[PDB]
Amino acid sequence: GIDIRVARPEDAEEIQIIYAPIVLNTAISFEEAVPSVEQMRERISTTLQTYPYLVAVREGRVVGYAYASQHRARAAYRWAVDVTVYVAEGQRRSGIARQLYDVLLPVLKRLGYRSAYAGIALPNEGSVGLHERLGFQHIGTFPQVGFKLDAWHDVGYWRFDFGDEGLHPEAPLGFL
C-alpha cells in the first residue's frame, strides 16, 4: 500500500540497508564507503533539525526514503534546497519515488523555499523522466565530474520552481 511518514532514528537500520548496495554497487551516491547505523542514525536526526526526512513503508517495512538538505553553505543561498529520493533495490520503479516527492515537495514549498534541486548521475533515463514529469527543468550538467566504480560520471542538475516574491527566511520542520 506504501504509506508515508516522517523518519525517526529507529528506522536507521532499515534505511542503512536500502543505502548499502546504492553506495557499494552504483553511481547514484558518490559516497565510496557504506556508512554505519550509528552515523546513519545521526544523519536522520541531524537533518530533522531543519529539513524534512520521509520514509515509505510496505507491510510494516521501509522500502524507500526521501530527504532535503542544504544546497550551498552561505545565507544568500538558503532558499535553494537539495532533494534526494531513494527506493528499494527490487520493486519500486517510479513508483514509490513519485509518491515520496508528492509529499516532500509541497512541504518544502510551504516552508518558504523557492527552488528545489536534484542531481542525477547520468545516464538515468528513468529518473530523468520522472523529474520532468514532476515538473523539474534541466538547468545543466557537470561532465566527467565524478569518478566512482572505475568510471567517470556526468552529473545533471534539475530545478523545481516554487514561485514567489518579497523574500523572508525559510522555516524549519515539526519536531519528532
Added chain:
Amino acid sequence: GIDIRVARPEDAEEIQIIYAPIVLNTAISFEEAVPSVEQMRERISTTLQTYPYLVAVREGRVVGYAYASQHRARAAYRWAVDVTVYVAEGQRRSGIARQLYDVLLPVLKRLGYRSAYAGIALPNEGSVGLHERLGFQHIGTFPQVGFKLDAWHDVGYWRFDFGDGLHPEAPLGFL
C-alpha cells in the same frame, strides 16, 4: 611590473582591501559580511595546506589574487576543483586576471586535477569573456539561486578541461 607569487599570511591586509568591496557592493561573492584581517589570515593558511593560493604584485603592492578550493565534499569529486580570481577595482580590465590564471591552471593540471569550475554571478560580460576566451565551456546556469543586496542573482558555471588511469590528486608546498 606584475610579479606573481605564492601568498603569505602577511598578504592578508591588502587582500582584505580587494575582497571587501566585492563583498559590500557586488554578488561576485555571496558572503555578506567582511572577514577580519586575522580571519583572512586563517583562510590563506588553511587553503595553502592543500590548494594553491597566489597573489599578483605591482610596484610592491598586491593588486589581485587567486585560489582553488574543494568543489564538492565526497570522494568521487576528488579530481574536481573550483577556481577563484579577484583583481583590484582600479585594475579592472587590465590583464592581471588572465595572467593570474596562466600560472594557476598549469599548477592544477600537474597537481592531478581533472577539471576546474568557476561560478560566475550572471550580469557579467567582462568575466564570461575572460573564461570563454581561456578555454572554459559554459555547462549550465543556476537561475535565481541566491539573494544578496535586495536582488536575486543567477549563477552560471564554466568548466576547464585537462585530459584523460585515474590516480588521486596531489597538494601544494608550504614555505
